[PDB]
Amino acid sequence: VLSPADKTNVKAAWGKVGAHAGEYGAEALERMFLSFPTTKTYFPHFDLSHGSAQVKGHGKKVADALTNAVAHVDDMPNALSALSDLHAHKLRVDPVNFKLLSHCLLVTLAAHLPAEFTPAVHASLDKFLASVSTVLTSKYR
Amino acid sequence: VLSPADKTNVKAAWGKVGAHAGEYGAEALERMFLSFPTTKTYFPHFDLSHGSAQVKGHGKKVADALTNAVAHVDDMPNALSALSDLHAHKLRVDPVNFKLLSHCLLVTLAAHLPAEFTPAVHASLDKFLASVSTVLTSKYR
Amino acid sequence: MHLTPEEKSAVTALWGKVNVDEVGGEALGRLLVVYPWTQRFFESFGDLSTPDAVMGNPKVKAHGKKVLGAFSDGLAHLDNLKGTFATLSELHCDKLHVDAENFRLLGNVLVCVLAHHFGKEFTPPVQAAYQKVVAGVANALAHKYH
Amino acid sequence: MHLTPEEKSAVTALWGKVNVDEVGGEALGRLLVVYPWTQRFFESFGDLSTPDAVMGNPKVKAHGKKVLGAFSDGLAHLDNLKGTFATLSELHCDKLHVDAENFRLLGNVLVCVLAHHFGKEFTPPVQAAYQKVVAGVANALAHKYH
Ligand code: HEM
Ligand code: HEM
Ligand code: HEM
Ligand code: HEM
């Protein structure tokens, strides 16, 4: 579970992201597509070329959902219900991919928040992302 | 989340195991050591040779814990707290290993309960071993 | 592969006793039942609403046999699974858009099906050799992913 | 290890700028902090009770450098990781009893560490190349496990 300390770390780190969340969401996706090409099998309908608007468009929706989870850190199961149903019943994204995107989001944050990305915050962000993945995968079967 | 049908399925399948739980436990361990040699790193103090008394014993302990989990499928978290603590704070087994033992447990059940190991039961057992795994790795960090 | 002649012989010897028809249908069927998210690729096969609808589906059974068949040929080319599955790899990637992780799910389901069928005969050592083959196969099928 | 000429150039060029002293200790420390169960291997290192106790531990710092030095050598032999890492693989298995999964956890932490240090210079394509390398090294360190 997320400790009070964990919650503080996340709010502060996400806090700093601010208005760049969407740009960071886009970048995380891009890093994921490049490092783990199997993930692209889920976006066959997308232009995955560099600077694709589709990717920019999608990165923002992903960032918004994370921004929403931070906002409702104490009720994540409910705040993300909808996204969980969608991923489980419509998209049917294999669960391993959540870990790949999480990893890419950490790298993205690390690359942009040098001062904030401390060992303790890095641990809190990992646990957080793991919690979000867990929720989004809870209604799979 | 285990459905009532899953719960039924498990109780039914495990009911059939009966006095053989311990043997199935020792066989599942044996299959994991053999199939996934990295799992052996956790038992440097054991004689891992075929028919080892240590392996036989340990087989019984795991099988017994599973039995207790079936009995309290409604309250696993509490039925398994101590075990979650041991694994999380004492043994500190990497979480990936749980999936390997689970798989070997299914393999063993399949080979011993041909009539009972139906597609619906296989899925329930799979979900069950996954819930058990979740509980046991829940206090890791 | 990194199969010992002994492991090679174990795999091969058991395979000889395999009823491809029954095993292929069962392996594909359990895949769709156990990991329902894999049904996303077989929408056109029909009603997969239930275990029973899935196991009885002839399209599932027939495709399972086509799948175990390819598997069989790979067992005939264990020293070059890569070259044997190159065409099938690009198809699964470029045409089918199938997450390569599904190859691993299927491999494990297969092991469970061999255990179910062969019982006592599917020993820890035989299982160990088959774990290596399924991993090999799964890697070969994902090799041309880009 | 499908390192294209360009991936290899990319890996190497960046590695040119790394202070192995530094990065080694950050990566090892971060491991012990993010995945606390990994502390199991180092109870002889003293206090690992808090992030500061871990990150500033002279023992973690010195061990990390030893590790990055070993890693550094693998980068000079991208051609032969298995041979390069064989005696270390055997050591970690047989004498240290280190679960091989630990090598992939470290690889990921190292990637976060390179990102942390290089900022914008650790581009998506550079990450992809490093991803291939740490998997390569993890596999070479696990090669002799039995
Ligand atoms: C923490 C992780 C994730 C979050 C927060 C997230 C969130 C979202 C959101 C907000 C949407 C848009 C839904 C809408 O139309 O309103 C979406 C769609 C989608 N997601 Fe995720 N997702 C996550 C993980 C993943 C992963 C790991 C994959 C696959 C590699 C994935 C694949 C997809 C796909 C294919 C769509 C539909 C896109 C389209 O057709 O426009 N998601 N997700
Ligand atoms: C289904 C999941 C599991 C269950 C129910 C389980 C159950 C148990 C039980 C009942 C014990 C003995 C506690 C006692 O001595 O009172 C134990 C100990 C232990 N477990 Fe697990 N375990 C599971 C998974 C794992 C896995 C996956 C590993 C590592 C690969 C592991 C490693 C160990 C070790 C090393 C010990 C101590 C053995 C000894 O020193 O005697 N466990 N476990
Ligand atoms: C060992 C693993 C596998 C092997 C050897 C294999 C082999 C094959 C073969 C031989 C075909 C024939 C298609 C053609 O020639 O046009 C095929 C098609 C296909 N495969 Fe696989 N496959 C494997 C795993 C999977 C998995 C796990 C999935 C998804 C869960 C998958 C999805 C598909 C689909 C959707 C088709 C198209 C069938 C159709 O045309 O309706 N494959 N596969
Ligand atoms: C890139 C991966 C790694 C490399 C290149 C590496 C390299 C090394 C080297 C060069 C040594 C010293 C050998 C000796 O004492 O003769 C060592 C020792 C050791 N390694 Fe690793 N290692 C790696 C990953 C790990 C991981 C992930 C762990 C556990 C989390 C680990 C556990 C150990 C331990 C416990 C020792 C001995 C510590 C002591 O002196 O008390 N290694 N490793």
Side-chain angles (χ1 to χ4, degrees), chain D residues 108-126:
Chain D
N108 287 333
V109 173
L110 176 77
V111 166
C112 290
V113 165
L114 299 172
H116 190 223
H117 283 229
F118 292 94
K120 136 284 130 184
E121 228 178 312
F122 200 74
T123 70
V126 158

Side-chain angles (χ1 to χ4, degrees), chain D residues 31 41-42 63 66-67 70 88 91-92 96 98 102-103 106 141:
Chain D
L31 181 82
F41 300 109
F42 311 99
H63 198 71
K66 166 185 303 192
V67 168
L88 231 34
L91 184 91
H92 289 74
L96 307 173
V98 175
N102 286 118
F103 315 129
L106 186 55
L141 279 157

